[PDB]
Amino acid sequence: MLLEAPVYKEIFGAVTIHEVQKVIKMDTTISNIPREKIYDLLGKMAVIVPMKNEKLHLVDGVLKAIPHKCPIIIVSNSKREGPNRYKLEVDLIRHFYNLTHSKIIMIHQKDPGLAKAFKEVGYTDILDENGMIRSGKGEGMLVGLLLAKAIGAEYVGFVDADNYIPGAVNEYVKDYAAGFLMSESEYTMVRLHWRVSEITNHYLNLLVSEHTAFETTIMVTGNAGEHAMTMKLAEILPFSTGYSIEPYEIVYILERFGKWENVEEFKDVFDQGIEIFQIETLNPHFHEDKGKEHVKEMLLLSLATIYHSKLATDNLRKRILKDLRDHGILGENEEPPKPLVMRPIKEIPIKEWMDIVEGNSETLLRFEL
Amino acid sequence: MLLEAPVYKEIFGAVTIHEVQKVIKMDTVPIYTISNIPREKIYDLLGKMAVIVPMKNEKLHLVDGVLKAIPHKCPIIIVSNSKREGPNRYKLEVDLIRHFYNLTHSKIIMIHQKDPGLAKAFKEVGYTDILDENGMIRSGKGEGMLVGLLLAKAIGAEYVGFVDADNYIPGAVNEYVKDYAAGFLMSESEYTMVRLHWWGRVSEITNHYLNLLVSEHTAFETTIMVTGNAGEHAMTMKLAEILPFSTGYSIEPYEIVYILERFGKWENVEEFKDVFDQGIEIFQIETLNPHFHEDKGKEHVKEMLLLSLATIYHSKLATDNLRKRILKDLRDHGILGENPPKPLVMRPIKEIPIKEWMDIVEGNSETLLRFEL
Numbered sequence A: 001m002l003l004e005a006p007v008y009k010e011i012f013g014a015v016t017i018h019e020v021q022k023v024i025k026m027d028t029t030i031s032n033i034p035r036e037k038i039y040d041l042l043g044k045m046a047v048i049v050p051m052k053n054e055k056l057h058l059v060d061g062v063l064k065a066i067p068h069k070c071p072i073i074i075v076s077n078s079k080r081e082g083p084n085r086y087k088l089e090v091d092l093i094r095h096f097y098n099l100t101h102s103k104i105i106m107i108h109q110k111d112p113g114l115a116k117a118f119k120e121v122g123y124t125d126i127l128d129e130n131g132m133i134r135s136g137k138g139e140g141m142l143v144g145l146l147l148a149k150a151i152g153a154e155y156v157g158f159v160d161a162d163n164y165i166p167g168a169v170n171e172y173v174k175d176y177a178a179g180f181l182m183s184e185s186e187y188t189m190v191r192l193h194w195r196v197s198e199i200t201n202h203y204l205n206l207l208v209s210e211h212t213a214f215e216t217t218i219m220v221t222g223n224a225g226e227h228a229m230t231m232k233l234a235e236i237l238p239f240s241t242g243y244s245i246e247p248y249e250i251v252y253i254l255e256r257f258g259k260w261e262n263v264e265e266f267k268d269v270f271d272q273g274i275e276i277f278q279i280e281t282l283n284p285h286f287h288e289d290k291g292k293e294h295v296k297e298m299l300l301l302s303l304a305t306i307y308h309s310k311l312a313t314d315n316l317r318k319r320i321l322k323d324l325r326d327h328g329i330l331g332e333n334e335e336p337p338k339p340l341v342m343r344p345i346k347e348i349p350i351k352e353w354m355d356i357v358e359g360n361s362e363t364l365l366r367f368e369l
Numbered sequence B: 001m002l003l004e005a006p007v008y009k010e011i012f013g014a015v016t017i018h019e020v021q022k023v024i025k026m027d028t029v030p031i032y033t034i035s036n037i038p039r040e041k042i043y044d045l046l047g048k049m050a051v052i053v054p055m056k057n058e059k060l061h062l063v064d065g066v067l068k069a070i071p072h073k074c075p076i077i078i079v080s081n082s083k084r085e086g087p088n089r090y091k092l093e094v095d096l097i098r099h100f101y102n103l104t105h106s107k108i109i110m111i112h113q114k115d116p117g118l119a120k121a122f123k124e125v126g127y128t129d130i131l132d133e134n135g136m137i138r139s140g141k142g143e144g145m146l147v148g149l150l151l152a153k154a155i156g157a158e159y160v161g162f163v164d165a166d167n168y169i170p171g172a173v174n175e176y177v178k179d180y181a182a183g184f185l186m187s188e189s190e191y192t193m194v195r196l197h198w199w200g201r202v203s204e205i206t207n208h209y210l211n212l213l214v215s216e217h218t219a220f221e222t223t224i225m226v227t228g229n230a231g232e233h234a235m236t237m238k239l240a241e242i243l244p245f246s247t248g249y250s251i252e253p254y255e256i257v258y259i260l261e262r263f264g265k266w267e268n269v270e271e272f273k274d275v276f277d278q279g280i281e282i283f284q285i286e287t288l289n290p291h292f293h294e295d296k297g298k299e300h301v302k303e304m305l306l307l308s309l310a311t312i313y314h315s316k317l318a319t320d321n322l323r324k325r326i327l328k329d330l331r332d333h334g335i336l337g338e339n340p341p342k343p344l345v346m347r348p349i350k351e352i353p354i355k356e357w358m359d360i361v362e363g364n365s366e367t368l369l370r371f372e373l
Ligand SMILES: Nc1nc2c(ncn2[C@@H]2O[C@H](COP(=O)(O)OP(=O)(O)O[C@H]3O[C@H](CO)[C@@H](O)[C@H](O)[C@@H]3O)[C@@H](O)[C@H]2O)c(=O)[nH]1
Pocket: A050, A051, A052, A053, A054, A075, A076, A077, A109, A135, A136, A137, A140, A141, A159, A160, A161, A162, A197, A223, A224, A225, A226, A243, A287, A288, A290
């Protein structure tokens, strides 16, 4: 694969944010990551696919696009009765495995065996009030992260299921790989790119240029649904609820590692640094339209995340408030609610959590994995 | 890569038409009813295939995305019929191709279809089927492809594959080129064709009359043919050199029509005995990616329609019933009057002394552009 070389970038504390790189030649001042090495790192990377009532044909399409050596981890939160939508997914995953023999782990987000392993090990941030796993994409992604960890993955990749272009999924995974192959740190994150988006980036760069007195544009993925991390970084990041999860990754990292304070706590991260790559994909971004109400909830908690940043300023908040209010989304004297943030899965006795899950969960399916 | 095994088919004379197969898994122990074509094999095959990209006035960033997705080891051959003055748009393409070459060092050959040096080589060698009233090369895609094919031949390619430029999904392009190799790897014959699949759509309607062209002689109707209008296809130079190419958009459906009226019966075998011995194998693969081109308008849409159907209507294999109902819904729709033309067909390029032809082209063409190829 040929890419523009990571020539430029910006540096806040121990965080290196690279300028967006375009893919130049999809298959082989310019960087050259060969196919053999990409396809090579690939087997150490688990691709997590958060699923929810998605259409079976798009799901199938996405599944077929993941390169065979990537272990696939699926976490559905689909309607489970009237009709049992999950069973419909179980049927497809079973047919898919018979026709491909792809290594796949799948589980439902609301499975009682999951809530039990979480209570037992003392991790409660992911539970609703009834002690059941809370609905949300970040919530399912977190579960995916522990499963990927339970199988000893070094890198994790997220890809959505409502994609009209299987081919784009195939490129996302290879783009992640190249993103880690161009990295020098053990703590690396690769985010991808192709209005919610633009609005979130606008305020994210604003979040930074308020202290630096220089308006910036560096961040173009504040809202990347498609992204990836080295298990090492993923385990120390606290994760936010539902759709607020990718924006918060950025906000938390800047907040915690953008200055040199409390370095003794993360001595190794501060030394190696955090590297964030932003790769522009060749294939267009095309999802199922989920409707206007859905587009408004996302906008809401992605902007609420920036609003509560301990980095947000007087001015940053009002500008948000205004927009958030004159688009029929926030009260005229209402402040956006603080999105719930869950703690870093790090401290969890993984294999022990894995055996409680493995010995009490009715929805867990494993295939050569 | 995984596909559904080439289990079912239909045979007509020395022509075998495979049931459409689906790509099932993208990058790759045996699986029942599944064929496994390992990356290793597809990749050592690619350096042997020339990808031809006919193009005419397409948006530059699109042409860009397509070139970027073609595997690096495939030689690219571009034939442009793009506008020449006010503005010289071919000049724009030359610029994008040069910048693309400096960043990737891909092997590329580009030339403009109307190049006066090209009309000189065709005419000098005795090939006039491609020329207009006034000795200059005729506009039309079948025509561009024919030029691309001769260039592909000049550089010694064993396989040629066509990929359109007005594609919105680069990823798809990358998949097509691989689906072609897969098709040729599963083949047993040296004359092999691989076609991709993804009132009503023109596609659906073309196939309906083509299948009917066949059932009209079989007293059985089929739905075997699913790629009548396959703009994305590939052939072994071997098969490509003995096929006579139809004009404009009629080229694809005519390939099927010709092979059927020429090799669908065991007659006059002497002239193509190796072809009859080997047989013609035709693969039909349904791609994982959807089909998505820039739409060109109502006008363009039925020009294609008329041409595709005119071509089945004039087949020596066609009957009265067929011809009659093709007329019915060509008129019932805005296309025809109530008073179709036979599309022009050019001969096979098998007998054109490539070397003499190529070095005349190479010697007289003001638009030819080469790169490590
Ligand atoms: N497990 C689980 N998955 C979920 C849930 N909610 C949504 N998902 C899945 O997460 C993926 C994305 O969610 P969508 O609801 O489809 O959002 P979108 O409009 O597709 O937007 C996506 O791409 C944007 C790119 O800018 C992202 O910003 C956004 O977060 C999301 O990933 C889909 O596969 C969806 O089914 C959930 O509650 N639990």
